[PDB]
Amino acid sequence: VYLDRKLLTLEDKELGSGNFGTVKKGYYQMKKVVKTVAVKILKPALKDELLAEANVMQQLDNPYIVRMIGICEAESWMLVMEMAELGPLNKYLQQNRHVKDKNIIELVHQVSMGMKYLEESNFVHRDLAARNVLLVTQHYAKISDFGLSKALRADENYYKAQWPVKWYAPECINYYKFSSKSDVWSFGVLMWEAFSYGQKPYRGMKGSEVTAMLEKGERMGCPAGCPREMYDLMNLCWTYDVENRPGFAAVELRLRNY
Numbered sequence: 244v245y246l247d248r249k250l251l252t253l254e255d256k257e258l259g260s261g262n263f264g265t266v267k268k269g270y271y272q273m274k275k276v277v278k279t280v281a282v283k284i285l286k287p288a289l290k291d292e293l294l295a296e297a298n299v300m301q302q303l304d305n306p307y308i309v310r311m312i313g314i315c316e317a318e319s320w321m322l323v324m325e326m327a328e329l330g331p332l333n334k335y336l337q338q339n340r341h342v343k344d345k346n347i348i349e350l351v352h353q354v355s356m357g358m359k360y361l362e363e364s365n366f367v368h369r370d371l372a373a374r375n376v377l378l379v380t381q382h383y384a385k386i387s388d389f390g391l392s393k394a395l396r397a398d399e400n401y402y403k404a405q406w407p408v409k410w411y412a413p414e415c416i417n418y419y420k421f422s423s424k425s426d427v428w429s430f431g432v433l434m435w436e437a438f439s440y441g442q443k444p445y446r447g448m449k450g451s452e453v454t455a456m457l458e459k460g461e462r463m464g465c466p467a468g469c470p471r472e473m474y475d476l477m478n479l480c481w482t483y484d485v486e487n488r489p490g491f492a493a494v495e496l497r498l499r500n501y
């Protein structure tokens with residue numbers, strides 16, 4: 244899974260950044276054709292964290308998950324992935340307010356299929372948000388940013404940590420337990436973000452203020468122009484009790500029929 248640095252050419256402009264360091268556009272010389280790529284370039288536990296991210300991506304093979312090309316150890320550690328040219332979903336929608344709601348449903352349904360696969364694979368994403376959905380085209384979305392993801396043990400359906408608070412279900416905040424159902428709650432917030440054309444959720448509120456609101460049974464309101472069925476699904480994703488909240492099979496199934 245180890246790439247040749249001479250076969251990788253990086254562009255100076257940067258696509259994004261994270262605690263890991265920077266993301267740059269590049270080109271990798273494949274078997275004959277050259278492939279456009281996005282490269283995460285490492286800036287102390289980050290190397291192990293980047294390698295863990297690569298380990299998850301190596302195991303995943305689904306049309307709605309960003310594909311990794313490989314890793315390269317050169318001037319810095321690099322995670323080379325196929326390029327999703329149109330970038331993060333939230334920024335795209337902030338700049339393209341005329342996408343049809345039908346178009347949004349198609350994109351959020353694609354996200355549920357990638358997440359259904361991840362759930363079937365017993366991986367939890369733990370960072371599912373509109374900023375981590377990338378557009379290949381306006382009609383093809385892929386899930387990215389597996390830096391926090393975990394492979395669940397064969398005998399448990401959750402990972403217990405020893406944070407993007409606004410995307411986390413109550414059981415994550417209160418008990419530190421992350422499951423596919425926790426990702427479902429995030430998917431509900433992601434849906435809200437998508438239908439709000441990339442506005443931030445719980446605008447102007449502290450994480451502790453968000454937690455108090457949810458405990459009161461309050462939820463974000465319906466974004467302007469959002470179809471009732473999609474708001475209803477969001478509310479179902481925001482079911483307080485992990486046991487009664489739907490899984491991705493149920494979410495994906497509802498989205499497919501709609």
Ligand SMILES: Nc1cncc(-c2cn3ccnc3c(Nc3ccc(N4CCN(C5COC5)CC4)cc3)n2)n1
Nearest residue numbers: 258259260261266281309324325326327328329330331
């Ligand atoms: N963890 C992070 C943090 N940041 C980025 C990424 C990231 C990861 N990936 C994996 C595959 N593909 C991508 C990708 N792709 C991308 C494509 C286009 C843009 N945009 C840059 C700004 N641009 C304006 C400046 O000129 C117009 C709009 C398009 C950004 C990212 N990004 N991962």
